[PDB]
Design a binder for this molecule. Structure first.
Ligand SMILES: CCCCCCCCCCCCCCCCCC(=O)OC[C@H](COP(=O)([O-])OCC(O)COP(=O)([O-])OC[C@@H](COC(=O)CCCCCCCCCCCCCCCCC)OC(=O)CCCCCCCCCCCCCCCCC)OC(=O)CCCCCCCCCCCCCCCCC
Ligand SMILES: CCCCCCCCCCCCCCCCCC(=O)OC[C@H](COP(=O)([O-])OCC(O)COP(=O)([O-])OC[C@@H](COC(=O)CCCCCCCCCCCCCCCCC)OC(=O)CCCCCCCCCCCCCCCCC)OC(=O)CCCCCCCCCCCCCCCCC
Ligand SMILES: CCCCCCCCCCCCCCCCCC(=O)OC[C@H](COP(=O)([O-])OCC(O)COP(=O)([O-])OC[C@@H](COC(=O)CCCCCCCCCCCCCCCCC)OC(=O)CCCCCCCCCCCCCCCCC)OC(=O)CCCCCCCCCCCCCCCCC
Ligand SMILES: CCCCCCCCCCCCCCCCCC(=O)OC[C@H](COP(=O)([O-])OCC[N+](C)(C)C)OC(=O)CCCCCCCCCCCCCCCCC
Ligand SMILES: CCCCCCCCCCCCCCCCCC(=O)OC[C@H](COP(=O)(O)OCCN)OC(=O)CCCCCCCCCCCCCCCCC
Ligand SMILES: CCCCCCCCCCCCCCCCCC(=O)OC[C@H](COP(=O)(O)OCCN)OC(=O)CCCCCCCCCCCCCCCCC
Ligand SMILES: CCCCCCCCCCCCCCCCCC(=O)OC[C@H](COP(=O)(O)OCCN)OC(=O)CCCCCCCCCCCCCCCCC
Ligand SMILES: CCCCCCCCCCCCCCCCCC(=O)OC[C@H](COP(=O)(O)OCCN)OC(=O)CCCCCCCCCCCCCCCCC
Ligand SMILES: CCCCCCCCCCCCCCCCCC(=O)OC[C@H](COP(=O)(O)OCCN)OC(=O)CCCCCCCCCCCCCCCCC
Lengths: 48, 106, 347, 83, 175, 291, 98, 171
């Protein structure tokens, strides 16, 4: 019984990981724009 | 923060319950009661038991990552090294056992 | 000890040293030292007496201090280079710490005070391992980190060791005390030449081990541990006094014996780099070692000290000690000078 | 033999705890080698995607690399569902 | 103030070290090492080392220091000494705390001090990483790699622990 | 809002421990053909209150500090053990909750050492050293057994033991481990037949709560969390009652015999079963997910 | 370097001086030898964890196992010293002066 | 050293996907099969270029394909999707296996009103290939020239001239 259930749990984890992989590009794109925007903001107050 | 708050409460409450338990009794003001080398000696058996615990405990720390170790693609190496660590954990005991390290007769 | 356990413990002493010699990772170097120290404490206690326990404790405290400084130097090196490779260190403070850790592990002056006491406190067989096999692992590390070692530090230690070892031996009547101070003085030669030519540090290590093993083997054959007990040897095994004379003259660096060869090659390597004062001072100071070796030959081979009546009863029995490789060791210790060019095999 | 069945029968009578321990440890060491399902353990560990699957630049001669996640090409987990 | 919890934790780390380094009776000596060990785990926790920090409690404190106190109770005086009641023990404690307090003053005032190495007092958070959203713990993956990558580490570490048992039985037998 | 949660955990624990003393005396009594407390309050329900008041107004060392630290450490660490317990939601959700409890449980041996040390009696000290040796010896099997169980679970998370046992209790695949675990907890809590007060009885409940989670997992329905708590409470209560049941029915071990019970029976068997449970998921292809 | 390093390096130095400056109990010096290890564990773990050097994550564990194995050997020697003299005083270990 | 180049705030602007994490999780499987092309081009850019600045345009098309994806759902399948991600959002772990009924209703909705097929197990984890026109980054690490190697000692090994030539030795 433990073997059957653990196999079923590995399949659910693969699905859980695959939902993340589908979303990683969109999160990666927004992370890039937040890092650069924060760096650009810091550069302005640095100039002043 | 939650963990630090919980630990602080647990050990603050223990501290309060300990000091007042040391002071609430002095409310009674009970009458004063007139009650006027470096080895215990210690037996070497009670030392060996502690040291054997320490050395086995160290070999347990080596095994603790076992649940994570089973997730690797190199399962043949992982399994061989896991059974190696446990077996030498047994070999140590068998040496203790056969050399009377686990006895209590003096 | 049970003989099987004794063998396994000796192979762990060897395994720890080999781990240090074959490792390209600093953690495995540390582990080899830790394993090596762990297995050598047993053989030091194996006769069970207050003196053997004092020696083992003084050894443990000294070696444990050295390993924590070695680990501290390894971690500083990691912080400043982000890598673990056994090679030159990337921080001068890491180099000072490692050099002092290895100096402590070798017993070099001024980290020398444990060597005479620990050696006197254990058996001759255990002392042989302490003064011979134990030098390999620290030496093989100094061999690889030398391009970053501070020259004033390594040369300061070496000169101090040649002085402390030479002077300390003059006042000794215990053979294990004499050998310990001889070991200190000889370490000073191996590290003096290390910044200039590490090959001549290996040459002096090999030859010093061969002659030191020959001495201990000969002391073990007759179970002699004091000057006066050794002075009876002429009246039991006259052959042994001749070999003792020859080996002691060799350790003194007198030509044409093999012990002259390392001192010869180091002076050559130091002058090539325009070090004239230091080798002159070093070579003269080594005359102290020859003096208290010469004293030993006077009471053993060149005169006949008074004997005892009960020595007559020993004449009827043969030597049964194994004396392994003694015939080969004594011939490498005395007759190897003509083959000096063969030192290139160590290149 | 029979000199051995008498040995085993003696330990089973005097030290049942150790006979069990040495039986379980032998099974632990031996069974993984003889099991037909030990291969599926490697595959399932190899099939779990922890990292992002970085695409390959399509030079023009990668016939077996799919162009879309739902394309027929590439490895499949069909065995995993039935298993 | 919580932004310098790692620096505040490391100050108590040093005070606990001054505690047992000044060497009171070996019973308060072991109490100072327990407090530092626990505070030392706290620092490792705040850097992402959950498993390493918990290995300190489980192994170092609940294993090694337990055996220290056990051994101390069996062969050491049995009677402690009032902490700081001895002149040398008190003189070293104040000396340590004075240097601990002086280092803390110049680093926080000047946001920098220079002792052998250069130290910058802007805070510890300033060096933290700004990129991770993996669905695993990197510490755990590094430690779990011991059984796959570290075949050689396990062998020598296993041998040393077996030999430790053999060695310690010989040392204490007495014949 | 978090402060209420920590209070809503501590106070019930102290009340539960207070009335565990009552249950102990009545359960032992009836197994001995008597009644136990039934005079102080109806069915004895006020007996714990009477004992508490009397204890704190009764009239009350080598090291003053250690005589104060010993009660705090035991009492503080006994309460700390409850913060990660999924009932079904933990107060503090830890990814290494199981590892946290082994760590805190290990520190419990200090109060024994300190209390014995602060006593000032050579005789008292050796009695503490015997108790410390019993505890650490039996901590070995708790750690190894727990590791063998976590190989079927997949992590150190305590709420993952709930998910591990969604279809079936771990007692069925691991009854040989559950047996040695249950005895090890009695030895760890120095309970009969291994007895060779608030913090002590808090551990007893907590260890049996941890036993129910480890081996008798209750199904959790996120829409009705209260059902899990009721079923969870019943399982832990009966496990706690079995401690009382065991105490009434057995004589005591000798000290050398309980050391022999572990070093020569549990540890050899606990090691083998650890080997077995590392191999079994690999050879059956039932390795649990890492997350 | 960062600020926390100042104190972890301060703690190693403190326990180093405490180790080299003995008093009487040999136990008090073994604790200084374990304070040094504790500081080196924390120093290493901060370096390895901050730099994200994944495979080095097991270095602190190995360092903790070996040093504890060392302390087990050190305590054994202390206990054997205690047998011969009834105390762990370091001034009773002076036979080898001659 | 030079001045770290930074694109101005005007270039970093784009219409965000302002839906919570459980909304993304519920659409993630369909999202990864519908927006795969622009998604994979952006990720190939990031790994190839190793620079968030060199892939700011590709990252804007990721938002554009994502916003369009969520409008397809809002136009045809709003209620089945709202009912579904509201079930996911309840769980602390946001577990898929707790909402298989609501997931089903969402799947027939899109498979009838849009023609979408949920990718099978293992599909989104394939390594695929992307046709791109962006030129391959030739020196992504901005390496300097590598130092020249030392000359290769070559030739025949003749015996040493007159032997070792050590002091007086003639061999
Ligand atoms: C693959 C094979 C690997 C070979 C190494 C095996 C290691 C285990 C040793 C086996 C053994 O000794 O027999 C068990 C045996 C156990 O009997 P026991 O009853 O339990 O012991 C009774 C006492 O408790 C103990 O006996 P004791 O107290 O009466 O006296 C013991 C003494 C007995 O008398 C002697 O053995 C003295 C002669 C040995 C010293 C000369 C060694 C060669 C020097 C290098 C130059 C060679 C070129 O032997 C020793 O001292 C043991 C250690 C000697 C090694 C000293 C290290 C020198 C540095 C070498 C560095 C260069 C290495 C690479 C080359 O102990 C012996 O006494 C054997 C003596 C007869 C057989 C000798 C075979 C070994 C000879 C030494 C080999 C040298 C290799 C380097 C060893 C490194 C060690 C750290
Ligand atoms: C290829 C590797 C190249 C090296 C070849 C080395 C082979 C020779 C092995 C000799 C040996 O077994 O060690 C003697 C080994 C150690 O005994 P020992 O007390 O140190 O001295 C020899 C006994 O006196 C001997 O007394 P024994 O009456 O018991 O003689 C028995 C021994 C025959 O006795 C012997 O012949 C041992 C003497 C041979 C010379 C010792 C080995 C020297 C290795 C070469 C060193 C070269 C140094 C560098 C050259 C100078 C620089 C260019 O018979 C055997 O060893 C059977 C041969 C099995 C191999 O004894 C035994 O063989 C059994 C006892
Ligand atoms: C079966 C072997 C087949 C065979 O016989 O052919 C090989 C060889 C003859 O073959 P070959 O076709 O004529 O070509 C070689 C030429 O003879 C010679 O041609 P080469 O000169 O071009 O090659 C020799 C060359 C390279 O060769 C060498 O490095 C080694 C040369 C020694 C080989 C001697 C053969 C070993 C047997 C004699 C051992 C007795 C030693 C004294 C102890 C007496 C105890 C009873 O010599 C050197 O460079 C080293 C010069 C001397 C180094 C002295 C180091 C200073 C400290 C030691 C001084 C102590 C006084 C001397 C005692 C030690 C003996 C050196 O056998 C011999 O008869 C040896 C001839 C000796 C030539 C030595 C060169 C003059 C140096 C004189 C030193 C005094 C020792 C003379 C000993 C001669 C006694 C016989
Ligand atoms: C003896 C008394 C012991 C009292 C408890 C000591 C602290 C234990 C903390 C711990 O290990 O928690 C694990 C837990 C395990 O958590 P985790 O590792 O499962 O998850 C962390 C959170 N995630 C998963 C999101 C990354 O630690 C944490 O929760 C992380 C740290 C939180 C912040 C607390 C930092 C300071 C810790 C306390 C310092 C105490 C100093 C020493 C006191 C004196 C000596 C006792
Ligand atoms: C090889 C190239 C380099 C050349 C350098 C020279 C190398 C030579 C040294 C290498 C090692 C060889 C050692 C030689 C051993 C000689 C032993 C010997 O000849 O007999 C010693 C003698 C025998 O005694 P006994 O046991 O009674 O036997 C009687 C027989 N029935 O015992 C006695 O009777 C007692 C003797 C009294 C003590 C005399 C002391 C003087 C000994 C001089 C020889 C040693 C010289 C060594 C230095 C080298 C010299 C150049
Ligand atoms: C910068 C380095 C940072 C670390 C230093 C800060 C202090 C840290 C605590 C370390 C304290 C070590 C000193 C305690 C000690 O071990 O003293 C030993 C010895 C006195 O030993 P005792 O037997 O008790 O008395 C004999 C006197 N006749 O020694 C004595 O004579 C007593 C001296 C006490 C004063 C110690 C001064 C600080 C230590 C020197 C630091 C130099 C670096
Ligand atoms: C008594 C037995 C003593 C212990 C020796 C038996 C241990 C058996 C278990 C280990 C066998 C090796 C298992 C293995 O296959 O590991 C392979 C490993 C690499 O893993 P892999 O998946 O093949 O990927 C390639 C990456 N290189 O590649 C490796 O790293 C393996 C290299 C390991 C070195 C083995 C030699 C050990 C010899 C020293 C032993 C030290 C302890 C005992 C010393 C005895 C006393 C002196
Ligand atoms: C009988 C089966 C049972 O316990 O009833 C199950 C019921 C709800 O089912 P549940 O166990 O939560 O889910 C199973 C899959 N997870 O849960 C319940 O019925 C509520 C709990 C009532 C049953 C008590 C649990 C069984 C008895 C175990 C108590 C421990 C006894 C220890 C005895 C050993 C010492 C001698
Ligand atoms: C077999 C594999 C295939 C499986 C298929 C099924 C077949 C099963 C066959 C198993 C046969 C195993 C037989 C082993 C019997 C044990 C040896 C023995 O007889 O020991 C007896 C002895 C008793 O000790 P004691 O009671 O103190 O003294 C006598 C007082 N009347 O005790 C001693 O002598 C001391 C011995 C102690 C060490 C034994 C326990 C090992 C350490 C614990 C680890 C257990 C796991 C095994 C690890 C080994 C590697 C796998």
């Amino acid at each position: 019984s433990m073997m059957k259930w653990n196999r079923e749990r590995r399949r659910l984890q693969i699905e859980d990981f695959e939902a993340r992989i589908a979303l990683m590009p969109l999160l990666q794109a927004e992370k890039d724009r937040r890092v650069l925007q924060m760096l650009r903001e810091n550069l302005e107050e640095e100039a002043t | 923060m939650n963990l630090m708050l919980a630990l602080l409460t647990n050990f603050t409450l223990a501290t309060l319950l300990v000091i007042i338990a040391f002071w609430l009794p002095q409310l009674n003001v009970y009458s004063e009661k007139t009650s006027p080398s470096a080895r215990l000696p210690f037996s070497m058996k009670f030392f060996l038991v502690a040291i054997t615990f320490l050395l086995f405990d160290l070999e347990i720390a080596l095994l603790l990552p076992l649940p994570w170790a089973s997730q690797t693609a190199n399962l043949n190496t992982m399994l061989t090294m896991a059974l190696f660590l446990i077996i030498l954990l047994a070999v140590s005991l068998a040496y203790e056992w056969t050399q009377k390290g686990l006895e209590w007769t003096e | 000890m049970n003989p099987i356990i004794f063998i396994i413990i000796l192979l762990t002493i060897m395994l720890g040293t080999i781990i240090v010699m074959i490792s390209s990772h600093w953690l495995l170097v540390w582990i080899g030292f830790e394993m090596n120290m762990l297995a050598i404490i047993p053989i030091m206690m194996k006769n069970h007496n207050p003196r053997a326990t004092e020696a083992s404790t003084k050894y443990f405290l000294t070696q444990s201090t050295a390993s924590m400084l070695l680990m501290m130097a390894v971690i500083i090196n990691l912080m400043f280079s982000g890598q673990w490779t056994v090679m030159k260190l990337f921080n001068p403070m890491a180099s000072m710490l490692m050099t002092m850790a290895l100096a402590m592990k070798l017993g070099m002056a001024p980290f020398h005070f444990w060597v005479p006491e620990v050696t006197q406190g254990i058996p001759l067989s255990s002392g042989l391992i302490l003064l011979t096999w134990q030098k390999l692992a620290p030496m093989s590390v100094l061999y690889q980190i030398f391009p970053s070692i501070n020259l004033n530090l390594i040369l300061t230690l070496s000169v101090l060791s040649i002085l402390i070892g030479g002077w300390g031996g003059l006042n000794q009547t215990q053979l294990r005390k004499i050998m310990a101070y001889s070991s200190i003085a000889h370490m000073g030669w191996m590290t003096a030449v290390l910044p200039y030519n590490p090959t001549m540090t290996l040459l002096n290590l090999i030859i010093y081990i061969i002659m030191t093993s020959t001495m201990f083997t000969m002391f073990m054959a007759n179970s002699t541990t004091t000057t006066l007990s050794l002075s009876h040897t002429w009246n039991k095994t006259p052959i042994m006094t001749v070999l003792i004379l020859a080996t002691l003259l060799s350790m003194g660096g007198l030509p044409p014996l093999s012990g002259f060869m390392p001192k010869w090659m180091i002076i050559q390597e130091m002058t090539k780099n325009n070090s004239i004062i230091l080798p002159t001072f070093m070579a003269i100071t080594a005359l102290l070692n020859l003096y208290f070796y010469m004293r030993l030959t006077y009471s053993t081979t060149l005169t006949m000290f008074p004997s005892t009546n009960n020595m007559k009863m020993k004449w009827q029995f043969p030597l049964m000690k194994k004396m392994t490789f003694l015939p080969t060791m004594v011939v490498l210790s005395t007759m190897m000078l003509p083959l000096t060019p063969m030192l290139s095999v160590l290149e | 033999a029979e000199r051995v069945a008498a040995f085993l029968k003696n330990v089973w009578a005097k030290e049942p705890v150790l006979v069990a321990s040495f039986a379980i440890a032998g099974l632990a060491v031996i069974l993984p080698t003889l099991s037909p399902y030990t291969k599926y353990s490697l595959m399932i560990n190899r099939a779990t995607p922890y990292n992002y699957p970085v695409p390959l630049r399509d030079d023009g001669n990668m016939p077996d690399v799919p162009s879309h996640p739902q394309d027929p090409q590439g490895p499949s987990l069909e065995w995993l569902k039935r298993l | 103030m919580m932004l310098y919890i790692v620096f505040i934790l490391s100050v108590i780390f040093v005070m606990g070290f001054v505690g047992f380094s000044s060497k009171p009776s070996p019973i308060y000596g072991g109490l100072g090492l327990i407090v530092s060990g626990g505070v030392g785990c706290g620092i490792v926790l705040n850097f992402g080392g959950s498993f390493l920090g918990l290995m300190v409690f489980l192994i170092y404190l609940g294993g090694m220091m337990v055996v220290f106190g056990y051994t101390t109770a069996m062969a050491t005086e049995q009677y402690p000494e009032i902490w700081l009641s001895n002149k040398a023990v008190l003189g070293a404690f104040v000396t340590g705390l004075l240097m601990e307090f002086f280092m803390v003053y110049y680093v926080l005032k000047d946001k920098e001090v220079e002792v052998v190495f250069e130290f910058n007092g802007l805070g510890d958070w300033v060096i933290y990483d700004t990129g991770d959203s993996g669905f695993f713990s990197e510490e755990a993956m590094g430690i779990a790699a011991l059984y796959s990558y570290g075949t050689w580490l396990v062998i020598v570490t296993g041998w040393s622990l077996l030999i430790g048992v053999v060695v310690i039985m010989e040392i204490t037998r007495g014949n | 809002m978090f402060m209420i949660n920590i209070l809503m955990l501590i106070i019930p624990i102290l009340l539960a421990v207070a009335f565990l003393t009552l249950v102990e005396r009545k359960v032992l009594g009836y197994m001995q053909l008597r009644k136990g407390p039934n005079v102080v309050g109806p069915y004895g329900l006020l007996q714990p209150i009477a004992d508490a008041i009397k204890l704190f107004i009764k009239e009350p060392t080598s090291s003053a500090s250690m005589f104060i630290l010993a009660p705090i450490m035991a009492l503080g660490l006994a309460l700390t053990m409850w913060i990660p317990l999924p009932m079904p939601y933990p107060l503090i959700n830890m990814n290494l909750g199981v590892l946290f409890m082994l760590a805190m449980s290990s520190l419990a041996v200090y109060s024994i050492l300190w209390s014995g040390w602060a006593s000032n009696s050579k005789y008292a000290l050796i009695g503490a050293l015997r108790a410390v040796a019993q505890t650490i010896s039996y901590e070995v099997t708790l750690a190894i057994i727990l590791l063998s169980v976590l190989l079927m679970s997949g992590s150190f998370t305590l709420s993952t033991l709930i998910t591990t046992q969604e279809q079936m209790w771990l007692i069925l695949p691991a009854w040989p481990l559950a047996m040695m675990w249950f005895i090890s907890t009695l030895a760890e809590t120095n309970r009969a037949p291994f007895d060779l007060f608030m913090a002590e009885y808090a551990n007893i409940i907590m260890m049996n709560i941890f036993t129910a989670i480890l081996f008798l997992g209750t199904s959790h329905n996120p829409h009705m969390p209260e059902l899990y708590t009721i079923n969870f409470t019943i399982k832990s209560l009966l496990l706690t009652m079995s401690f009382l049941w065991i105490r009434a029915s057995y004589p005591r071990f000798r000290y050398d015999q309980l050391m022999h019970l572990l070093w020569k029976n549990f540890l050899p068997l606990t090691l083998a079963l650890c080997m077995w449970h590392v191999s079994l998921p690999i050879l059956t292809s039932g390795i649990p997910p890492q997350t | 370097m960062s600020m926390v390093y100042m104190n972890i390096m301060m703690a190693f130095t403190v326990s180093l001086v405490g180790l080299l400056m003995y008093r009487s109990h040999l136990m008090s010096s073994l604790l200084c030898l374990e304070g040094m290890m504790l500081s080196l564990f924390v120093m290493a773990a901060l370096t390895i964890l901050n730099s994200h050097f994944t495979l080095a994550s097991m270095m602190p564990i190995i360092l903790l196992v070996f040093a504890a194995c060392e302390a087990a050997l050190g305590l054994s020697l202390l206990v054997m010293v205690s047998n011969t003299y009834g105390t762990d005083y370091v001034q009773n270990l002076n036979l080898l002066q001659c | 050293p030079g001045i770290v180049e930074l694109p101005s705030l005007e270039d970093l602007k784009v219409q965000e996907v302002k839906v919570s994490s459980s909304v993304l999780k519920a659409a993630a499987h369909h999202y990864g099969a519908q927006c795969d092309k622009p998604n994979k081009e952006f990720m190939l850019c990031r790994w190839e270029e190793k620079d968030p600045r060199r892939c700011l345009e590709e990252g804007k098309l990721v938002n554009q394909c994502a916003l369009e994806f969520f409008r397809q759902i809002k136009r045809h399948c709003a209620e089945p999707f709202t009912e579904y991600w509201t079930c996911i959002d309840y769980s602390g772990l946001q577990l898929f296996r707790r909402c298989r009924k609501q997931q089903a209703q969402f799947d027939e909705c899109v498979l009838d009103k849009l023609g979408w097929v949920r990718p099978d197990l293992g599909d989104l984890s394939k390594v695929t290939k992307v046709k791109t026109d962006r030129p391959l980054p030739e020196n992504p690490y901005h390496s300097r020239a590598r130092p020249e190697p030392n000359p290769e000692v070559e030739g025949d090994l003749k015996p040493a001239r007159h032997g070792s030539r050590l002091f007086f030795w003639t061999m």
